[PDB]
Amino acid sequence: KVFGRCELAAAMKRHGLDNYRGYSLGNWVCAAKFESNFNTQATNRNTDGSTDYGILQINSRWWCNDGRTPGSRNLCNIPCSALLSSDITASVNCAKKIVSDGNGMNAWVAWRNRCKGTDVQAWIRGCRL
Numbered sequence: 001k002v003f004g005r006c007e008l009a010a011a012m013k014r015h016g017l018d019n020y021r022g023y024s025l026g027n028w029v030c031a032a033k034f035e036s037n038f039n040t041q042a043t044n045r046n047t048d049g050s051t052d053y054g055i056l057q058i059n060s061r062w063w064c065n066d067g068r069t070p071g072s073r074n075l076c077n078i079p080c081s082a083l084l085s086s087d088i089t090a091s092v093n094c095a096k097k098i099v100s101d102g103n104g105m106n107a108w109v110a111w112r113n114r115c116k117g118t119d120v121q122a123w124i125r126g127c128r129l
Contacts, residue, residue: 001039001040001041001086002037002038002039002040003032003038003039003040003055004038005029005033005038005123005124005127006124006126006127006128006129008029008032008038008055008088009025009029009123009124009127009129010127010128010129011088012025012028012029012032012088012092013025013129015088015089015092015093016092016096017092017095017096020096020099021096021099021100021104021105022104023099023104023105024120024121025123025124025129026120026121026122026123026124027105027111027115027120028095029120029123029124030111030114030115030118030120030123031056031105031108031110031111031115032055032056033123034110034111034114034115035052035055035056035057035108035110035111036054036055036056036057038055039055040054040055040083040084040085040086040088040091041054041084042054042055042057042084043084044057046059046061048061049068049069049070050069050072051066051068051069051080053066053080053081053083053084054083054084054085054088054090054091055083055088055091056083056091056095056108057108057110058076058080058083058091058094058095058098060072060080061073062075063075063076063094063097063098064076064078064079064080064082064083064094065078065079065080066079066080066081075097076090076093076094076097078090078094
């Protein structure tokens with residue numbers, strides 16, 4: 001599913017992501033924009049053989065099982081395919097664990113490089129929230 005910007009903001013809010021670990025909703029929408037372009041089916045293979053999945057590009061090295069990342073963990077206790085669903089629940093629940101792991105949203109490289117320190121409220125501006 002390719003979400004619209006305000007559509008994703010609303011889904012993230014409903015699932016409790018807004019202000020989670022102190023990160024306002026625009027931070028989450030901006031991260032999704034640059035990780036996945038709002039496409040739940042996004043995937044990206046990394047040089048190490050791990051893969052990033054879904055709207056927040058969550059990595060199989062640590063967070064989900066894909067059966068093809070040796071020595072990896074599955075700390076969200078989910079198949080990585082669950083992160084590709086039209087329903088963002090699994091992605092949101094796993095993102096809450098990631099952002100709680102000590103480095104905040106710096107876990108998402110596109111957030112650090114493209115959202116951190118910017119006017120992230122622009123991503124939710126205009127939305128009926």
